[PDB]
Design a binder for these strands. Sequence first.
DNA 1: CGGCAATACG
DNA 2: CGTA
DNA 3: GCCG
Length: 331
Amino acid sequence: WMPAYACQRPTPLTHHNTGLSEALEILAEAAGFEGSEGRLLTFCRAASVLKALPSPVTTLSQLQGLPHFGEHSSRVVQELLEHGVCEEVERVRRSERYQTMKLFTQIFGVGVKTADRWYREGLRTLDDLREQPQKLTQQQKAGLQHHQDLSTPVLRSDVDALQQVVEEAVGQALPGATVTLTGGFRRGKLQGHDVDFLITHPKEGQEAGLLPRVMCRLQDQGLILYHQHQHSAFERSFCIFRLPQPGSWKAVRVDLVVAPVSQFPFALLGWTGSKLFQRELRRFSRKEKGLWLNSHGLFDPEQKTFFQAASEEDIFRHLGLEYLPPEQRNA
DNA sequence: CGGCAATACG
DNA sequence: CGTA
DNA sequence: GCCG
Ligand SMILES: [Mg+2]
Ligand code: NA
């Protein structure tokens, strides 16, 4: 069988329906470009269902009984099985609207609304945006200047170098503080487009005011190309690191998050992803268990109490779910 | 229809 | 609006 | 788009 929520099933990084899931995610992405979050979500879910399957889908009948597969998603798979291509998907791929929206939304500091506005104004290329720099935010300027690097896959080797750099600065800012690699790379990805770190300290309260000290020490080593700090919500910094390369360097998006150790398991769970996994997990928590989950804790609205967690295993237990290791959360 | 994760901070 |  |  196949449970309805992605958090109820192991989803490996690599699977047996790559072509089909990729096609459905094109439509998901396109739906988001047109402001259709509901449709995006369904296409994302349907694609994730195929990721969780134990073998390739070869016939349309194998879609029977599968959640989030209705008339539209089944037709897409049906055409792919029969012709090798889905005309709607190909029509989307080739369209100027999709290509331009995809180009713009990949820019750091540019979301759908902004990308949509720029498109309606007649803008189509990166150079179009560069010709009118006066109307760009500092965040967008940085994303535009470093677009080529940020669009280049980050390798696991790169991540390890970045971690030792972060751990060095963190170690000086607060002795005893720890750094944990999260996000996609914790889920076993061999390459990605950004890096996420979670920072904490074994003694509750000592992690307070840590990130400004960390950022200052990183800035002193000339490693920060862009910095956006958010105060404690955990204290967070969305950065662009200068990562040393053979004879040169490249820009990499790095997120630093500091959480008190008491909330660390919730922060780790939220920041490990995947994005769809977390959305599904929180949807499951609220609608099936009547509990409110976020990156900070798990709230029982009936008893008005927060669940204490010492580990991710605790959280899955609280929600009555079988534990899933990070590399099985690739929904 | 009513919902679709989360929600503070820049 | 954007970041997550 | 799909679910209830
Ligand atoms: Mg990130
Ligand atoms: Na982005």
